[PDB]
Amino acid sequence: WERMRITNCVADYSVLYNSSASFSTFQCYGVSPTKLNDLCFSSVYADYF
Amino acid sequence: VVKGDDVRQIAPAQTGVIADYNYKLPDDFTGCVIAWNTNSLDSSNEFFY
Ligand SMILES: *[C@@H]1O[C@H](CO)[C@@H](O[C@@H]2O[C@H](CO)[C@@H](O)[C@H](O)[C@H]2NC(C)=O)[C@H](O)[C@H]1NC(C)=O
Numbered sequence: 001w002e003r004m005r006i007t008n009c010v011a012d013y014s015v016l017y018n019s020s021a022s023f024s025t026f027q028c029y030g031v032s033p034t035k036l037n038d039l040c041f042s043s044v045y046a047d048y049f
Numbered sequence: 050v051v052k053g054d055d056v057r058q059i060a061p062a063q064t065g066v067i068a069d070y071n072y073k074l075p076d077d078f079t080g081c082v083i084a085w086n087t088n089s090l091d092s093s094n095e096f097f098y
C-alpha cells in the first residue's frame with residue numbers, strides 16, 4: 001500500500017456528488033460525518049490499496 | 050425507493066446525497082428502519098433523486 005499527503009486544501013465532498021462514484025462502506029471514527037464541513041484539519045494522510 | 054448503496058444513509062447522524070438533499074432523520078430518533086431488495090419489481094420504472 002502507498003500513502004499520500006494532503007496540504008493546502010478546501011475539503012468539500014459535494015464535488016463527489018457531481019461524479020459517478022458510489023461508496024458501499026463509509027465509516028468515520030472519532031468524528032461525526034455531519035461535522036466534517038465546519039471543521040479544519042492539521043495533517044491529512046491517505047492510504048489506498 | 051432508494052439506490053441500494055444508500056440504505057446505510059437512512060440513519061441518524063449520516064451524510065451523503067440522500068441525507069443532505071432528499072431525506073433526513075433527527076439525531077434523537079426513536080423508531081425502526083426496514084429495507085429489502087425489489088430488483089424483480091422496480092427495475093423497469095422511473096425513479097429519481
Ligand atoms: C460537474 O461535472 C461536469 C461534467 O460531468 C462539469 O461540466 C464540465 O465543465 C467543464 C469546465 O467548465 C466544461 O469545459 C465542460 O464542457 C463541462 N461538461 C462536460 C460534459 O465535461 C462541471 O463543471 C462540474 N461541476 C459543476 C459544479 O457542475
Ligand SMILES: CCCCC/C=C\C/C=C/CCCCCCCC(=O)O
Nearest residue numbers: 006011013016023026036044064065
Ligand atoms: C482526498 C481526501 C482529502 C482530504 C479529505 C478529508 C476530509 C473531508 C471529508 C472526507 C470524507 C470523504 C468523502 C466522503 C463522501 C461521501 C459520499 C457518499 O457517502 O456517497
Ligand SMILES: *[C@@H]1O[C@H](CO)[C@@H](O)[C@H](O)[C@H]1NC(C)=O
Nearest residue numbers: 015016017018019020021022
Ligand atoms: C473518472 O473520470 C472519467 C473521465 O471524466 C469519467 O468518465 C469517470 O466516470 C470517472 N470515474 C469515476 C469513478 O468517477
